[PDB]
Design a protein around this ligand. Sequence first.
Ligand code: HEM
Ligand code: HEM
Lengths: 212, 213
Amino acid sequence: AMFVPGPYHAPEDRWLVDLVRGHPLAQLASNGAGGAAPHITHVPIIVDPELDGPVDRLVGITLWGHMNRANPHWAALGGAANVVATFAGPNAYVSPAVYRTAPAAPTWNFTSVQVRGELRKVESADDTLATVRATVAALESRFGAGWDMTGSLDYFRRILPGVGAFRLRVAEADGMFKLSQEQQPAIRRRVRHSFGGAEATRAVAGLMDRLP
Amino acid sequence: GAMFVPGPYHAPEDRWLVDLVRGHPLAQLASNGAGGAAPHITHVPIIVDPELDGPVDRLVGITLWGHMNRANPHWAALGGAANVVATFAGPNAYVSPAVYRTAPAAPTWNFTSVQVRGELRKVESADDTLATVRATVAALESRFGAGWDMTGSLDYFRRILPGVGAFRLRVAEADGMFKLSQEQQPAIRRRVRHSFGGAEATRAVAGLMDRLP
Ligand code: HEM
Ligand code: HEM
């Protein structure tokens, strides 16, 4: 489980799915053997592409991911590893200068999703190639420029042996939406207004604008 | 090696890892879950030892300062001398093969990461807790802030202090992923760098690519 103070809960389950879709390069964590620090790999993870219809909740759905099979994290997972995948969205430092109140302390507004469950390794070549093609389809659509993978499928197949594809059955899903909900209404407005004025912070202002 | 980093994605200089830690202080702190559970992950503000003089070129051997909420189960979970990783995530951008203008190809994600490992030591004294949060204001307000003066709030910090869980992390191992199209042919790296220079969202990635030898 993930610690999320009451005020930082998403208004709706759909916000956690939106952050996963918007920020697919997750930090995949699993336990380190013999009391060592956890293993951490940045990996591209998407929602099950076979899910037709609105996906409102992460709990009960399967995420699809891959990493490098030669990455020692792949061997360390073994068979039924309990893992967390952390998705990190828009974030910005909050200067109390923005509050125009006193006294105060600074903070950092940020967005995260933590999904936990059992990681199963894909061994099937068909399921592995489906994983990377669904990942092209999902990320090129949201982040890309209309690139057509069709002419590169032979190439995908040539490099496929190196792919460690996986499936993560989401047992638990938690979302930090730390967006100044602890402040009084006028101060939340001052913060939202200050973040509206620059590209680095507009995405945070966007989420703050959608709070009930 | 505790973090997997293909040879092409090694930083040019140890200083690049220190730069990313300074630029991206909101780290993800990870420690093992009890009895096969998944790791505990908390976003925590972390800075370089403010007492360091000289140029800081290497993370290994320096102490990082940070805090978290004592009310967070992760605080009780860390117990004594917990082995932890703190991951710092810098500039990043999806790479469309449309930018490469080459075939065949596969998309990728250019990103920067630093993973530091060592033993987390808790600070229990109020005087070391207070130092931790004051040092953190001085380091972050200067770099990310808008000229706020903490002077008027110094007693306020003491009046809201018990909830702070301050810690020290002596860096035993530091690894850095600088995934910035080094695997592509030079003409293609240039195409990605020029593409990423044409939008604010991707400019920081272009800037790192421009600083590669
Ligand atoms: C669509 C976007 C994609 C992204 C963001 C992406 C991202 C990544 C990342 C971050 C890793 C490294 C994980 C680790 O450190 O262990 C990786 C490894 C790998 N991916 Fe993907 N991938 C994508 C599509 C593909 C496709 C379509 C293929 C086709 C087969 C592929 C083949 C590989 C291979 C072979 C590796 C092992 C490392 C290597 O030889 O380059 N990826 N991918
Ligand atoms: C300068 C930038 C600062 C940042 C970016 C920052 C960030 C954070 C974050 C992310 C947490 C939550 C950690 C968790 O989930 O366990 C935290 C907790 C906390 N911080 Fe800070 N902090 C800052 C400065 C301060 C200062 C100056 C104080 C003064 C006492 C302070 C007091 C606290 C307290 C009491 C908590 C416990 C939970 C709460 O009451 O919000 N912080 N801080």
